[PDB]
Amino acid sequence: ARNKPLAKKLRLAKALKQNRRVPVWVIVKTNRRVLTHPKRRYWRRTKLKE
Amino acid sequence: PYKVIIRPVVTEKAISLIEKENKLTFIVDRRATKQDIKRAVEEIFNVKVEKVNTLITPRGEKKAYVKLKPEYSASEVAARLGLF
Amino acid sequence: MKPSEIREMSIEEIDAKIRELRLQLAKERGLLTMGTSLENPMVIRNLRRDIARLLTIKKEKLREREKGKV
Amino acid sequence: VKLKAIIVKDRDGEEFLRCPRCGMVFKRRKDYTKHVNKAHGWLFGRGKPKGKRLQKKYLKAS
Amino acid sequence: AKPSYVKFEVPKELAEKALQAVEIARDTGKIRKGTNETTKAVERGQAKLVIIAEDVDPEEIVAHLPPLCEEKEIPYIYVPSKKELGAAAGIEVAAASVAIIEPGKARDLVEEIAMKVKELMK
Amino acid sequence: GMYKYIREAWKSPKKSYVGELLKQRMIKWRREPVVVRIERPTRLDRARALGYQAKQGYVIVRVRVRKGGRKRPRWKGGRKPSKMGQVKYSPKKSLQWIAEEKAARKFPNLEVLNSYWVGEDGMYKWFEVIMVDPHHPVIKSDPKIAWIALKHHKGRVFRGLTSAGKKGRGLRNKGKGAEKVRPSIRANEGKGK
RNA sequence: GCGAGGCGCAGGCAGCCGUCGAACCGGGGAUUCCCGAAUGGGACCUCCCGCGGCUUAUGCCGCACUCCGGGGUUUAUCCCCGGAGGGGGAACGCGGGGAAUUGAAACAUCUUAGUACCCGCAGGAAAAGAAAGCAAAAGCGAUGCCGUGAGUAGGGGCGACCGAAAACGGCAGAGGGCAAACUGAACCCCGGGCCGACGAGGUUCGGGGGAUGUGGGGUUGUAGGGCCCCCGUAUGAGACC
RNA sequence: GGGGGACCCUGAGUACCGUCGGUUGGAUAUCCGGCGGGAAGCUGGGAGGCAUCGGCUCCCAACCCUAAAUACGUCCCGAG
Ligand SMILES: [Zn+2]
Predict the structure, then answer these.
(1) C-alpha F70 – ligand 1 centre gap (Å)
(2) What CATH number corresponds to the domain at position E65?
(3) Which domain holds residue E7?
(4) D:F CB pairs within 8 Å
(5) Phi, psi at D24, each rounded to 5°
(6) Domains held by chain E: number
């Protein structure tokens, strides 16, 4: 964990960026039809695939 | 010129660095090396670079601290870029 | 910018314009990250597509010049 | 019966001339014409078919 | 070292004389170049002398020439260099055998070669 | 011609000089690699009859194989008595076909045209394989052999389209007894062989 | 091409593009990071380290293994030019290796089954294909597919079960080339030139092959073909590029 | 383009025999493979469901290629 290969670090960065909420303006645009996406994650509960 | 520089960093830490240590903070492209960053800064801004430090943020982007020589002011370059 | 006016200028002018557009694009990205008064949110898109047009027409000129010379 | 050449492609993608009467493949037009004139020329009154069985079949058809 | 189809040892002088006879026959007579043509000439009984190469591999090409020549009463001699035999025959490629049908202006040379072959082993 | 004489000589090698020559040649060959290209064919008449020509793009390869059948690997799961045999088994492809496939493996850019027997001792068997280069302009320009240049003639030995392959598939028989051999072994439930 | 809107699923803010014809549609181009057959060398991380020419330098072009056709020499498979194979594809195809539950009311020959599955090899189809065949009052005349022959001939602890072809009626129809007899460099490929139209074709030079045979001819059954002899034909008539 | 010949050519560890294993409805008469033997070759050779002899009939292997009628549907029109 302290020492990380660059590719693994980049993959972790991509997952971190992936994890975020749905924009409120997107919710408004879809008219409360799109609220959540499958890729939400909790670090302690839902672990990364790698 | 060139594709090394993506965008200046306008954060409070960056501004403090410009004010104190004659350092400019940039977000550059990943494959760029320290020589590439130094050359890009020198050519674009017509300034002399004393040192370059680089890191890769947890978001996967490369950030460079470029410390200019005492002969040139980083505040002038920030003003030219609109950093304020 | 328009493809006709881009074709009007020479390769060296195209390279100079590409450099200026790249620098301005970096400046505008920094300004976007800094401020909130985004008067023209489409400036980034326009600059990027102008860069693409300039590079495409430069490549076209290179290829046509090579074909004509050969 | 017409004997116009049919074009085929090899592994490298070059061109061949395929006879539509027997399927033989050539790369040279001279050889294609020579084969078309020498092998199937009996169909136009120039020569006779080869083989007792083939001759019997052709006579029966005629 | 010597292939089995060679039935005797020929001196360098005799081999070079045979090569010269082949050259003169080519220039001012009739020769047959190649194993197939030489075999056909021997079978038809027209060749007055046969020249073979000592470096023919595989030797099945010329393994029948000595028995055939003995049966048909035709002198046959060996020469070391297949490529030089072909060059003397006049072609641009090596020849494994040659036959002389019309001596031309090498009649005495071929007669003496035949006599020497008879003395050696016929 | 010389071709008939070569054929007569190789009729029965033990009854001519070819016997001693083959003994010496086998002594030489036992020390050579299993697959080796050679400059010229040993049996010129056989090579010519099978389709060899003295032009660029043709290759002659000598291949050595071991005599006998095959021993099946030991079975690990339970088996009924009818399926336990290991020793008295023979390959369904002839040793000539196997040698041709070995030559094909050695040379990946060529196609196996034909093969013929060239000698055998009490342990090994030797075959000479004629192979062609489909990408050579000289080969392409020859209408006799140019058909190999077409796409659907790839891996012909592996699919069983050589003379040995046809013999193994039973395509040399017609009429009675050849009901399950056409149009293919698979097409007849793979039970005609 | 269409003709006033456009900025995906996706109904918002702001702004921009379009009548110099956008969006959109069909065709052709440009860009196309990294790994991946992955190939100059390595992978405990899809990231790194290399060697030579060109270039002022930026920055480009070459260097995997197994072979084919050439050249050089150092003879080292060492270097240079040209060209191949590698991996993928839902089902179908071709060639090999090959079980048991299960049925027989148990079970070993058998069945399951040349099946599941494994290895190898192609294409848009593949394989087969032109008789040393099929049939005998007659005869037919390449291959492939369907109907039928037929649960028949036949196999089988003659137990359970397994199991065709010919003929006949249809679809579709197509037949050709080698080895040898004989001739003997009259031949093929790569690059260049010339005449032709830029093509077909003709001719010429250099290189690589070729007498261990390039090219010409020849492909068949009471026979066919080479060679020899005799009669005539070609003036004409095809076919193809 | 036709007639005659008395000369030459027409595929070898191949066809085929014995034995062993697999496979097949192939049953003393299927096909493939291994081992040990193995010809004629045009005055020639092969097949006709046990083997051999004679007659008759039908053919010329041991080299090569071949479209259309067919199999499939990743995919595309159309239909229920
Ligand atoms: Zn044809």
Answers:
(1) 46
(2) 3.30.1330.30
(3) 2-121
(4) 37
(5) -65, 145
(6) 1
